[PDB]
Nucleic acid binder design. Structure first.
Ligand SMILES: [Mg+2]
Ligand SMILES: [Mg+2]
Ligand SMILES: [Mg+2]
Ligand SMILES: [Mg+2]
Ligand SMILES: [Mg+2]
Ligand SMILES: [Mg+2]
Ligand SMILES: [Mg+2]
Ligand SMILES: [Mg+2]
Ligand SMILES: [Mg+2]
Ligand SMILES: [Mg+2]
Ligand SMILES: [Mg+2]
Lengths: 88, 73, 101, 119
RNA sequence: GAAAUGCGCAGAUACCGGGAGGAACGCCGAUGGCGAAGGCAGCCACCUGGUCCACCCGUGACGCUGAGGCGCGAAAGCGUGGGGAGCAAACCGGAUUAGAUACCCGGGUAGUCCACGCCCUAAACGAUGCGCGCUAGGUCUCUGGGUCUCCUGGGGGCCGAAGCUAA
């Protein structure tokens, strides 16, 4: 799975400031954690079509927060992606 | 009506996840080997669910019976 | 690491020497698979509710272990390989759930 | 005349016939009988009179081998399942127990169409 | 219904013991639960989705819906392997009948099962698109929280205010 301190190293890795639990940057990061896990899971379990719906929604959620962050500070946007390795 | 012995009462402070406690578990099996109804264990819905899983582990271990046999007819 | 409980039913009919050999292979099997052994209890042999392996009794074991999750199925696999190991049941542990208390 | 004294009687009750087997305390049959054995032919065999006659025949047949007591084992839900037991009791055989052991799967084999219908 | 095909002296039915194998999970079990739907039920472990409550911590309208697209989609059916207990279209018999290409009975192939790949349908039904707000209550229930009589959420039912409806 993904453990508390596993997760923690990601929130602190991305918070705009100490105690920032819920900024766009933090969320788009946390999802990419969950997405890569899921897609790793479905490369094995290609028939777990139920879980696959999960992935379609995480992705839909990611590119939705991304679509916002790019409309707000296209700096932080091109910044998040280079950090996470997406859009490419 | 129809209220004779309810099995929750006629017992003490037992654990329900304990699959090794044959002498407490076998009180919830019928005269045959069957898991009893709630209207006969007097358990809560969540309680029965757990006893139901516990009894099954006990049967796999050979402590409780899967089935028995009626002795009057 | 999760906390499990390993049940082992044993051939009720072996002696001190074939038992002490089995328990050996059981704790060595554990060692090789990550099993840090918390508390244990050899409850011994009881009357089976139904004959297992044509015996009407079975010798019982029980280990409470912390061990790697990804290794539990092999640990149980390896344990069943033996011949006087009649049953293996590996449950993951749970907080008890009192009732009528 | 192999001498046994006590043993088991199996009643196999069914809708189409009743059928009684007597065995030694280990389950090897001593003697048996049924609705056809007592000269019935068609649907008459499952009648409860047949089960009386059949049970009584397999008792008399068994008291020759010297039976005296019997554990009874009902098996089935036929007509005259019970008229077979009544016969065994009134017969000169100690009926020390009656146990129903009708076999029943833990949902197992797809039944014949006759036997499933409205689920 | 009554029967007859059928099986049985190469010893069946009934009964005890041993073995093989395929399929399905009795009770619990429902008025219960999960899921977007189709659907989901022995037990255990692993991998993985959704969801609900409390805290009121963080972001600051990031929302809703959605033509095309894409994925999913019971059963039957298709391809290639495999498997094949029980069941059973077609088919082969026995009966029934005025006839009986049928209902009843004895057999039985595909199929049902597995893997992979197609098919894309249905009384795919609540015959009720999704989301949000507003408008009496009573009561049974599943699952959280609280000061636990009761209060407050989330779900499943029933009766009913206002109102709606051709009914
Ligand atoms: Mg706040
Ligand atoms: Mg602010
Ligand atoms: Mg389909
Ligand atoms: Mg199919
Ligand atoms: Mg095929
Ligand atoms: Mg058939
Ligand atoms: Mg037929
Ligand atoms: Mg409600
Ligand atoms: Mg409610
Ligand atoms: Mg009105
Ligand atoms: Mg009217």
């Amino acid at each position: 799975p993904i453990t508390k301190e596993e997760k923690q190293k990601v929130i602190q890795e991305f918070a705009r400031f100490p105690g920032d639990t819920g900024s766009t940057e933090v969320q788009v990061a946390l999802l990419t954690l969950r997405i890569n896990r899921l897609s790793e899971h479905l490369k094995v379990h290609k028939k777990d079509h139920h879980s696959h719906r999960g992935l379609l929604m995480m992705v839909g959620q990611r590119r939705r927060l991304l679509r916002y962050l790019q409309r707000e500070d296209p700096e932080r946007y091109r910044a998040l992606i280079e950090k996470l390795g997406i859009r490419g | 009506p129809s209220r004779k012995a309810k099995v929750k009462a006629t017992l003490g402070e037992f654990d329900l996840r304990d699959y090794r406690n044959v002498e407490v578990l076998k009180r919830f099996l019928s005269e045959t080997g069957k898991i009893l109804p709630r209207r006969r264990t007097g358990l809560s819905a969540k309680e029965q669910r757990i006893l139901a899983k516990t009894i099954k582990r006990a049967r796999i271990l050979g402590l409780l019976p899967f089935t028995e046999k009626l002795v009057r007819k | 690491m999760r906390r499990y409980e390993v049940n082992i039913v044993l051939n009720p009919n072996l002696d001190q020497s074939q038992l002490a050999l089995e328990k050996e292979i059981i704790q060595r099997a554990l060692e090789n698979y990550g099993a840090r052994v918390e508390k244990v209890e050899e409850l011994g042999l009881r009357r089976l509710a139904y004959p297992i392996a044509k015996d009407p009794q079975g010798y019982f074991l029980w280990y409470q272990v912390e061990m790697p999750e990804d290794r539990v199925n092999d640990l149980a696999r390896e344990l069943r390989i033996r011949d006087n190991v009649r049953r293996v049941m590996v449950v993951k542990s749970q907080e008890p759930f009192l009732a009528n208390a | 005349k192999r001498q046994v004294a006590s043993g088991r009687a199996y009643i196999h009750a069914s809708y189409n016939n009743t059928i009684v087997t007597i065995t030694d305390p280990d389950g090897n049959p001593i003697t048996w009988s049924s609705g056809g054995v007592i000269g019935y032919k068609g649907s008459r065999k499952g009648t409860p009179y047949a089960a009386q006659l059949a049970a009584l025949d397999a008792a008399k047949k068994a008291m020759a081998y010297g039976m005296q007591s019997v554990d009874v084992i009902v098996r089935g839900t036929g007509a005259g399942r019970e008229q077979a037991i009544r016969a065994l009791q009134a017969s000169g055989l100690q009926v020390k127990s009656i146990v129903d052991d009708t076999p029943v799967p833990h949902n197992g084999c797809r039944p014949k169409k006759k036997f499933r219908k409205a689920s």
